[PDB]
Amino acid sequence: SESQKETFRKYLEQAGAIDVLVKVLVQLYEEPSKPKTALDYIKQCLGSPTPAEYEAVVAERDGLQKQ
């Protein structure tokens, strides 16, 4: 529906915003070396999928084992 489409557009504009994807698109366009798969470019864009504190738990466990 038109109202459903407008609500979806408004929600996408508000939450997350188009600038987050626009930065990735601008980086991909600025980099001339573009791979055959854009999943690698998305992974190079990264964004800390696991949290920094979440990834530090294994490092803290390894340090405690080394201690």
């Binding site: 489409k5 979806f8 557009r9 996408l12 188009i18 626009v22 698109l25 601008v26 366009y29 600025e30």
Partner: protein
């Protein structure tokens, strides 16, 4: 000697910025126009879950004596969250739509202040019950 060291580079940078902005806007337009909400199957309701709906449809939408006759409006559908909100009898269907309204009439004399806040949640539960849970449920109600 043409003075192309400056100015030409600024024009090239402006053209590159305009091209990058146009490409970003094009990608955003493609992503926005790709939006669609997919069709999904109708979620089924359990027979025990359907047992509470039809009895409520008998109590709220088919009882002879209620406000609105046997065709009271607007239509309402039984949901467990709304029904538990009304719950929070000997016939087993206590704190129903008809039961609570006489009770809200009864509890107003004893505690109008308590009846004032509870009816606010009850009316919101009554408002939310107007929204049907499932597509075939409205067809079943009709």
């Amino acid at each position: 000697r043409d003075e192309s060291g400056t100015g030409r580079g600024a024009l090239e940078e402006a053209l590159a910025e305009k091209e990058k902005r146009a490409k970003v806007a094009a990608a955003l337009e493609r992503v926005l126009r790709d939006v669609r909400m997919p069709r999904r199957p109708q979620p089924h309701e359990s027979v025990e879950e359907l047992a509470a709906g039809d009895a409520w449809d008998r109590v709220n939408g088919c009882a002879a004596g209620a406000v609105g006759g046997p065709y009271a409006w607007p239509p309402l559908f039984h949901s467990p969250g709304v029904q538990s909100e009304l719950a929070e009898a000997p016939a087993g269907a206590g704190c129903s739509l008809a039961v609570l309204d006489e009770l809200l009439t009864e509890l107003a004399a004893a505690a109008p202040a308590a009846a004032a806040p509870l009816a606010v949640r009850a009316e919101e539960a009554k408002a939310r019950a107007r929204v049907p849970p499932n597509n075939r449920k409205v067809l079943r109600r009709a």
